[PDB]
Design a protein around this ligand. Structure first.
Ligand SMILES: Cc1cc2nc3c(=O)[nH]c(=O)nc-3n(C[C@H](O)[C@H](O)[C@H](O)COP(=O)(O)O)c2cc1C
Ligand SMILES: Cc1cc2nc3c(=O)[nH]c(=O)nc-3n(C[C@H](O)[C@H](O)[C@H](O)COP(=O)(O)O)c2cc1C
Ligand SMILES: Cc1cc2nc3c(=O)[nH]c(=O)nc-3n(C[C@H](O)[C@H](O)[C@H](O)COP(=O)(O)O)c2cc1C
Ligand SMILES: Cc1cc2nc3c(=O)[nH]c(=O)nc-3n(C[C@H](O)[C@H](O)[C@H](O)COP(=O)(O)O)c2cc1C
Lengths: 352, 352, 352, 352
């Protein structure tokens, strides 16, 4: 009677949201080629069990950046998810909190950093979105101060942002009432929705990456990599953690699938800092893989929204227990007692 | 007027069984990826005939473990097949017996080892299913005593058992009346269906593999391998015969197809002991292949159940003569006079 | 208004013939895998033009076995095609004759070798079909005497004949009235349809291949090869011409596509004798290829029958002018003035 | 409300034109295999971004043959496009002119070289089509005199022209009223539509290529190459610019896709002269690629016609701004400030 498939949701929460909503969450750049190459990508990595072993106990338990995120699956910073159930961002922090992991939110948020954190005690990150003039950035960066956003997911792949068709036919009406309370309205001194669609700096660089550092610590991640030329470059320029990504295949298409493009990104920066790929991932079967390639922990996107929008704080709370309760088969059946015994020593992958 | 296709059955016996039944037999883990990669897998091995030769006579005749199983195709231990025609397990032993091969039954059986063997004279194996406390196991192992189950198909791939979707939506009602008469009801001393779903040991190891040996002989097979790290390991730990498998792709998905994963499993353990892969196999065309790779004889699963459930003792009795009467084209047309002249010397295979 | 596609016919002549008929011509072994791998096979060989050259004149003109078969496309020995328009075999000899090539007919013919040849002056071959006792063979072989069948297409791939599904459900009624006038009725001395399905020798060998030679010359071809172990073997045992084939994918499935399996068959027997692959070929685009791989001339099957059955002597007479009038684009556009300048020097092929 | 997809047009302008029209523009040779291998070809080249860079400014700006074609996308010489909106050829020159690029027209044109050029000031080329007797050619070549067609796209792949099915069933009625005003009617001295289908020389060669040169300069391009044997041959025989092509896959099928066949064509003729591939290209995403392989600028075909036929001078005027406004994402997001920083150093491609 209860129904389990971690995306059986996509389609139910499809009928729950107004065209615009579903398409804002369900898009990809122009041809969207990499959308399905975000799922049918992990299918090109064949398993490789080991057997006749003790599996009474296992161990999802992590420690990313000196943080025990209860289990190795994390949440990726989706834009306005308060449109998809007026709470969203707010109940995701509490959901993850009960779930013991991270609830990562972007600047494009409905609930502000002032606003969400009232949800109380738990680990969470916040996506930086550098703009033209860095006075408002500088203050946003230091907003997630000793409130605690631990790190800052600086998104290096979103200067001019990807051409997801849909939007500009069914012209995305940013819901009149509903607001992006993370800035909600700024200006210098002489607006919302298109303030945010009224600010960013298309020339963000490893020199700005420089500045950001003297304005904080909060472990500055590299969000938006699929190559090793900006990987070794990433250790070359002081940091830890990487958020290898395509942008939910929303910025640029025909750019390799996070998993597929991974080996070269991990293998590049060796032992310096750990990598976390946030994309494609919708089951612990395929989650396993990423962790096999060398990406110590992984985030989650869309799957998390077709859940709140579907059924409140229970929505995502299965998106996480179904997810967690899927990495205890995968780790078990392949002969592993915890992350320690995983690695791509333990498998086979199509291309190779 | 008579209709032949060895799975033309699947679909007829589909309409014969209640949702649950069909789905219990027709499932695979979560995404079921390897389900079709269990058939469209052998299609990646191209034939390689030799011609202008004598084919008046041929030779399916075997001898696996010092047993002439009439012909090289065997039966794989399906769970309750008495649900799918109240007889099942019972009429499969008699069917195979008339068919001269092995009728392999699991612990998850409807008819008990006491019960089925009344069917009379013929070769058959029985799948061991080690549990938490090994007093009931120890006695089950020695149940198939000088009754004669020859070997024991110890299933090394089923600690925590695979997540076949279906079941847990159309919540598998283990048919109130109908019972798993192989244990049927045990307990220590102070139940059925969930006794069996109330017992097993998730820490089965090559140390338990040790014990089993001082409690019997009955040639202890290795059921559930798709790698050569647990293959050489399998000769390292005294035994013969292997039952390379995925579990009807029921335990774990995206783990190579028995045929595909085979070369490394045979090639690993060389000349020590013979290997038998039970999975995917539904025609002697594709049966041939396995035997070409080096797997001396092969078992059969699903195909055997969509036959009893379809048409009694005649059901499977074609599943075997259609099967047998399909290895006498294959062996003939490729220039072979018997198994002796087969081998993967005689072919070509996609990956290679 | 006139419609051209050399198989646009298949489907029209599909609706023209009784189930049995269409399926007798439109079958393949069991799963028929190689049926489409008989067409989507040549699609894995990419073209390779050369340009800015003289193409005022071209040259299909051949000489196979010291025979100028007007153009390089030939006809392959289909069984009873008199069922598919009561004339067939008869009007195919006359059709080819006007078309200047070969009209190859099998022993399974409706019109006898006595019977067809009344059609008059033109080149044609006849498929040998050796049987249990070789007294009737011996006389059939020497039937196509100084009448003129030039060569004998001895079919080395048809001892026990392929399991084309269809037939044995819609039980092939060999049309009561209509007969296989090539033997029509023999017996020793103490019947038709199942005389022929009442005679053959499953032990045909390179020792019988020996005998045949002292009973004739008529250039003994090797029909039914897809490997180089029976190729060099084919020069080892005195002959010329090969008829590399799968049997319209009717004998055995999953055995490579004539084109695909070709390189190794030509490349094997070098300069000794020429090879001709009869299978898959339905356009001069793809015809070209075979000739590129090294198969000096090629035969045609099915395409020739869905034409007589469709529209009399005009049917096949387009199957040949459409075919011929398709090799004068292919040769032209790739920079060639005749066969002399073709070869696989001139192309690219997927596998490679 | 406004709808963007650069071929969302194909289907609208499909319903706008009479069968013949759509099929004249929407055909390909016989099986049309390379039609989709003209699009799903660029999908086998995976992107390869570089990040955290300045993208305030970018640079489509070109200079092909000492010509700043405003942006790197050009127009390919489609036949009668006046059938598809009586203006066509005429409004394409003006469209491109406002768009700052080239408007390339063929001899098969509706509007003559006398006729179109009244449109005024802007860069444009004209496809040469050498005929049997070169008196009319000689005068056409020197027609695009100091009027200014800069170069001459000499089409080396169209002696005997490709067999696009369609046409010859729905027998292409060259619209009675409407004429090919580029010759419109010539004759020696003792007609239209089949004058043009009444003249050409199937023996065009690198010796005629010789002559053409002493009758002009106008940079003689090589239109119709997919190999490096006629590439080095192309520098061997004095010229610049190449127009690597298949002919909209209209001449010959199964001949590699312009992009796919490119590497060998560029890599062959090195630094001698620049190459421009006109085929497949319908987005700046995929446009990028060509330019990555080494083809300095690229032309466009069909996409340009399903636009005039769709909506006048605004039709193509989006086919160019949508196109141009799609190379400013692609160049931006991959880290590039202009063409200078592109190249296939910057990517990954399936085959490799
Ligand atoms: C609605 C939406 C908006 C997005 N906006 C951002 C953003 O503001 N910045 C960013 O770096 N990631 C953004 N993401 C992408 C994610 O943070 C994350 O990479 C992605 O959704 C993971 O892919 P998956 O959905 O297949 O798990 C966006 C994704 C969606 C669904
Ligand atoms: C209904 C069902 C229950 C199964 N239970 C067992 C089991 O108890 N233990 C075991 O090792 N095999 C079990 N198998 C799998 C087989 O023994 C065998 O590997 C498989 O069905 C062969 O795959 P095929 O169905 O494609 O031939 C199960 C299969 C099915 C269909
Ligand atoms: C109806 C039918 C009967 C056949 N019987 C014979 C036969 O008697 N012996 C033989 O060697 N070829 C036989 N062939 C196959 C051909 O001679 C030839 O290899 C084949 O039809 C070429 O394949 P295509 O149909 O794709 O051109 C048969 C084919 C068909 C269609
Ligand atoms: C209707 C039509 C007629 C064509 N005729 C010519 C021609 O006269 N000569 C030539 O070299 N190119 C001709 N082309 C092809 C182009 O010049 C160009 O290579 C092609 O249309 C680019 O392919 P695309 O349509 O996928 O962009 C023809 C194409 C079409 C659509």
């Amino acid at each position: 009677m209860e129904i389990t498939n971690v995306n059986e949701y996509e389609a139910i929460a499809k009928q729950k949201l107004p065209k615009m909503v579903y398409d804002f969450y369900a898009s990809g750049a122009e041809d969207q080629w990499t959308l399905a190459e975000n799922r049918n990508a992990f299918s090109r990595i064949l398993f490789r069990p080991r057997i006749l072993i003790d599996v009474t106990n296992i161990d999802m338990t992590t420690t990313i950046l000196g943080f025990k995120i209860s289990m190795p699956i994390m949440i990726a910073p989706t834009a306005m998810q308060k449109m998809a159930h007026p709470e969203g961002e707010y109940a995701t922090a509490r959901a993850a909190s009960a779930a013991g992991t991270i609830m990562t939110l972007s600047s494009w948020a409905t609930s502000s950093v002032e606003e969400v954190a009232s949800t109380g005690p738990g680990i969470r990150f916040f996506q930086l979105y550098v703009y033209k003039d860095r006075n408002v950035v500088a203050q946003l960066v230091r907003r997630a101060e000793r409130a605690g956003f631990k790190a800052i997911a600086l998104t290096v792949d979103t200067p001019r942002l990807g051409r997801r068709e849909a939007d500009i036919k069914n012209r995305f009406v940013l819901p009149p009432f509903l607001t992006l309370k993370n800035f909600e309205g700024i200006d210098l001194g002489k607006g919302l929705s298109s303030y945010v669609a009224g600010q960013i700096d298309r020339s963000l660089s490893w020199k700005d990456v420089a500045w950001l550092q003297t304005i904080t610590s909060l472990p500055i991640l590299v969000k938006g990599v699929i190559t090793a030329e900006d990987a070794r470059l990433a250790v070359q320029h002081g940091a830890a953690g990487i958020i290898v990504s395509n942008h939910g295949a929303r910025q640029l298409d025909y750019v390799p699938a996070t998993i597929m493009a991974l080996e070269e990104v991990v293998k590049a920066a060796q032992g310096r800092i750990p990598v976390f790929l946030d994309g494609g991932v919708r089951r612990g079967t395929d989650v396993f893989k990423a962790l096999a390639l060398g990406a110590a922990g992984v985030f989650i996107g869309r799957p998390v929204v077709f859940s709140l929008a579907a059924e409140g704080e229970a929505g995502v709370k299965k998106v996480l227990q179904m997810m967690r309760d899927e990495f205890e088969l995968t780790m078990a059946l392949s002969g592993c007692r915890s992350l320690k015994e995983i690695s791509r020593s333990h498998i086979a992958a199509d291309w190779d």
